[PDB]
Amino acid sequence: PTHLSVDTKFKTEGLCVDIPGIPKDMTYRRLISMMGFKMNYQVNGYPNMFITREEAIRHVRAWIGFDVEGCHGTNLPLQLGFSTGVNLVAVPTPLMYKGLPWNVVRIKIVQMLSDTLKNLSDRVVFVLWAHGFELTSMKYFVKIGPERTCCLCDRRATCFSTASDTYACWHHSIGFDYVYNPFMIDVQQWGFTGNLQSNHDLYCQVHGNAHVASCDAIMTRCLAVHECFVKRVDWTIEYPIIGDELKINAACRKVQHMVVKAALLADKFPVLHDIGNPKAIKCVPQADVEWKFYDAQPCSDKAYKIEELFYSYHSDKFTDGVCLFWNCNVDRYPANSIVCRFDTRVLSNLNLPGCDGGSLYVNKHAFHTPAFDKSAFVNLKQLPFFYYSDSPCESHGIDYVPLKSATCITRCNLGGAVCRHHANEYRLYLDAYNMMISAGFSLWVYKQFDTYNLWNTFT
Ligand SMILES: Cc1cccc(C(=O)N2CCC(C(N)=O)CC2)c1
Ligand SMILES: [Zn+2]
């Protein structure tokens, strides 16, 4: 069940206008052969250019939508589009480049895929809505063969140079001319009615169709992400560590405790309504409050309507005390809320472009997140940075400069000289806070919140 059998059937109706006469009866084996590659009954970790829906989902970080459009087949120029927004024109002799032979076009393709993917993935998955010219164009920029390692590292080979006769990974690929052992999946095999634009536009208003290869490449990947991550969700799939996943996750846990602890000391709510993760624990275990939990999974399509979360008849009175939405994305938080909300517009190696202004946040798990919406926070304000500790001032066991800060809310600062312990803890908490913010999370609080109210929790 692991890899896609080359003897699996491929539906060819999508191909039959670019490739008139194509047999209705077709295997991957016969297709790969038609595309001009040979698999030489090779047991060597590359059983099939094509992959399963499941294998594609495990390798979502590798997805590059790919589309070719006739400009005028061997006679005519081809427009090559990628979900990066790039259009190359190959001649057989948004970004829109003029006509150039394959021997240069293939160099740009390696550069582009290398720069896009070296910090995402060990491979490429071309995501297709196949009509034929994209499949027949692959021979011009792709070599296949046994799985290999980089010449300069232990990462698997994704590129090949005919100049030096060597293999590189995405990190070491500079001056290479061929994509080596790519993967591909044809979305059109998944059983849709009607064309790409009609299927994409059911779900997504944010990507248009200018009738250029890059636009279709983008719609193809977007529709795929919609199918695999919006409509269908799988929180039982792991994904490897490629960045600061672990620091960001730790940071998030530290800020959550800090902000909620300070909220209860400052405003002394008798009840907290904790709306979201059904595995959640009390983030402030010692706090005095009545802690009531409401279960909701991450919304991956549209933000939850607060009408549905709350009404339809709990503590019922969610106007009593404070509401904690920790990555529980709604359309409009009530005024008595503490909110963490992911900003889908953030550029990072963890956040992949998604469907209808949403983004795909891949950190241990994959979480499609609805489009960041400023209007959601109208009853709240941005939560200002601050560090609060009631821990004793006592070093124990990190070279020093005396810390001066208005936002270091401690006994020692109240007494006008921050102790070394609270200065180390403060500087750590600020780093965590910046990690978390710069990872795209944004924090919001009820308007009455005032760090001034914390200073009398020491007297
Ligand atoms: C509502 C709920 C249920 C379960 C877990 C969470 C949570 O805390 N997430 C998931 C989504 C989040 C994101 N949008 O990136 C990353 C961490 C939220
Ligand atoms: Zn390498």
Ligand SMILES: [Zn+2]
């Ligand atoms: Zn789209």
Ligand SMILES: [Zn+2]
């Ligand atoms: Zn101190």
